[model samples]
Target: QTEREKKKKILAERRKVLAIDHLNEDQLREKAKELWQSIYNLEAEKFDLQEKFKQQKYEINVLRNRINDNQ
Candidate 1:
């Protein structure tokens, strides 16, 4: 359980890579072509959310830092 988290995360990543490779290698790869279209569409929304999150996290962190500094 100690180091399991690290390995488990990496193992899932490898399996993810394996699935991608196998889908293109064994299947017709059409699934990826279709799925990628949806992924690409979702990625734009994901990018939008991350940009605001970046600004808010930084703004909130510095705001809290200044609040502590005042005390």
Candidate 2:
């Protein structure tokens, strides 16, 4: 199959796995909350990495300046 057809097939299978045909209202709500929590967790990790990158840049600049001063 073509790439587009392959993607559509995978997506359809994923939808089937996530289908809640037998889930009650409460179960559906809980599942939704779990998915949202995972999203938030990943976003929080991304934010943390960005902050660390800034710190790493600052430290590298500091080290470069220190080496230049000693030369």
Candidate 3:
């Protein structure tokens, strides 16, 4: 278990450095634009999910209130 933990930590540190290197070597602005587009898409999806969740919660609360009133 100790050996496995040591290897995991080493690999994590290496990946961290590699990510920093990628940032330092970012030259193509198009790639950044693509990244932003993906982020925007994800945000839009999240907004849709949030609206659905809000509607569901409101409906549930309304039903609960009706049950309480009858009781």
Candidate 4:
């Protein structure tokens, strides 16, 4: 649909700006909020990322413990 296309373009452009812009700290904070709002509006899959991050951290700890236990 045209609406989805327009949004896709907007997101692409926003990301380009975010990648290239030399923003101050405050501006960066505001831009981060805007980016997060865009994700929220798009109903992006954020929850799974957090869950995966947690699992990765747990796995790392398990590996570290095994190395220490065998040493």
Measured by TM-score, the strongest candidate is 2
C-alpha RMSD of each candidate structure in angstroms: 6.6, 3.1, 4.4, 12.0
The runs of at least 3 residues in candidate 1 whose Cα sits more than 4 Å from the true structure, single-residue gaps closed, are 1-37
lDDT of 1 by residue, 4-69 (tens): 998998898998777665654437477668779999999999999999999999999999999999
Which parts of model 2 have CA positions greater than 4 angstroms off? 4-22
Q: TM-score per candidate, in order?
A: 0.41, 0.66, 0.55, 0.39
Tell me how candidate 3 scores on lDDT.
0.84
**Model 3 agreement with the true structure over 14-42: per-residue lDDT tens digits:** 98666454663455466568769999999
**CA deviation > 4 Å runs, candidate 4:** 1-44
What TM-score number comes out for model 3? 0.55
The 10-residue segment of model 3 with minimum total lDDT is 19-28
Q: How many clashes in each structure?
A: 0, 0, 0, 0
Worst 10 residues of 1 by lDDT: 19-28
Clashing pairs in 2: none
TM-score of 2: 0.66
What lDDT, from 0 to 1, does candidate 1 have?
Answer: 0.84
lDDT of 1 at 35: 78
lDDT of 2 by residue, 1-71 (tens): 99899999999988857776567899889988988999999999999999999999999999999999998
The superposed Cα distance between candidate 4 and the true structure at residue 61, in angstroms, equals 0.6
In order of lDDT, best first, we have 2, 4, 1, 3
Query: What global local distance difference test value does model 4 have?
Result: 0.85
